[PDB]
Amino acid sequence: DEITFHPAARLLREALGRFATGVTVVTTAGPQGPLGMTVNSFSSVSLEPPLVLWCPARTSARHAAFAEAGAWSVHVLGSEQLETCLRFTRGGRQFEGLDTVLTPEGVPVIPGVAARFDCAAHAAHEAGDHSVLIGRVLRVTVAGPGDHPLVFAAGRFGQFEP
Amino acid sequence: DEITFHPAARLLREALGRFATGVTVVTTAGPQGPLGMTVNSFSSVSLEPPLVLWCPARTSARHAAFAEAGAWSVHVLGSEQLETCLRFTRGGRQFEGLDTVLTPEGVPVIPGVAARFDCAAHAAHEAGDHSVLIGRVLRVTVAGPGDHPLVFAAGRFGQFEP
Ligand SMILES: Cc1cc2nc3c(=O)[nH]c(=O)nc-3n(C[C@H](O)[C@H](O)[C@H](O)COP(=O)(O)O)c2cc1C
Ligand SMILES: Cc1cc2nc3c(=O)[nH]c(=O)nc-3n(C[C@H](O)[C@H](O)[C@H](O)COP(=O)(O)O)c2cc1C
């Protein structure tokens, strides 16, 4: 079955999709109201100090706000939160109809997610068509069981079966 | 159920584990033979140019080799490759008993994985107890179906159910 190609586009996207991920929504306080963006390019980076990374696309209108933000929060979604995922993708409702709750640092959050990491901006680097934002975790919130993540793999949403 | 804590250690590790991932092995040619390391801190970063990242721990004896390498390859494991995962973790056999196959750039590879990204070193940044290595994808190999990844979530290995 095995095939080899040089990445210079459908085939590369399919290949990268072979790496399973959770699903997050990264939020921040924008110039004119709350902002969020569905992300799966998140990674845990460091335990001491507690650091995480994620990559906003430089082709998004929200890139500047996330890149200039001092604080942002990463919400890890449970398998029952597909609708929350879809609010913060391309066509999505964003925060329209959602209650305004804020962290002490003023970041808009989504209660009821599997995990929320509230982060202070720590470092940022350009990486092609995306940036890499590294944040220091100031606070952690967990809710519910840890073993029912929303999983995205091979372009499809699904569950983890242990 | 919802609880909030400040990350300054068991609780933080459990929280970060709530983010589901695939499982990779990153390989390179070491000073005295092939090297590999099981990694789940991998992310797709950029399509144009094709870029990926992953984070080696700075507490590993293999960190210097990966950090100084010009070339390294990321192997995305299928659900049937737990043994390959375990070869390249803490106590593992590494390449002992495995056939030596090399890329044109001299990187030792593991045929038969779901995806292999052969990368040239592109950038590197320190991030606490880990480094962040960004590589430019020079070649991609895929084998078999794309929708049976080995998944690691909530500290357990498992499968994706779409
Ligand atoms: C499962 C999933 C994961 C995503 N991950 C990322 C990401 O890591 N970074 C990013 O900038 N956009 C990501 N997106 C896209 C953003 O949510 C984006 O603003 C929009 O959904 C995609 O369309 P657009 O690129 O045309 O705006 C993801 C979307 C989905 C469905
Ligand atoms: C599922 C899984 C994912 C891992 N991800 C990473 C990683 O992203 N970076 C890293 O440096 N080590 C990672 N490790 C650990 C390395 O494989 C490491 O050299 C060793 O397994 C863990 O023990 P040690 O930290 O005491 O050496 C992971 C291990 C497992 C089981």
TrEMBL record, chains A, B:
Q: Which InterPro entries match?
A: Flavin_Rdtase-like_dom, NADH-dep_flavin_reductase, Split_barrel_FMN-bd
Domain Flavin reductase like: from-to ranges: 16-159
Q: Which UniProt keywords apply?
A: Flavoprotein, FMN, Nucleotide-binding, Oxidoreductase
UniProt GO molecular function = FMN binding; riboflavin reductase (NADPH) activity
Locate the residues binding FMN.
38, 40-41, 55, 57, 90
- Record bears the keyword Cell membrane: no
Q: Does the keyword rRNA processing apply?
A: no
Pfam families of this UniProt entry?
Answer: Flavin_Reduct
Record's protein name? Flavin reductase domain protein, FMN-binding protein
* Organism of provenance: Paracoccus denitrificans (strain Pd 1222)
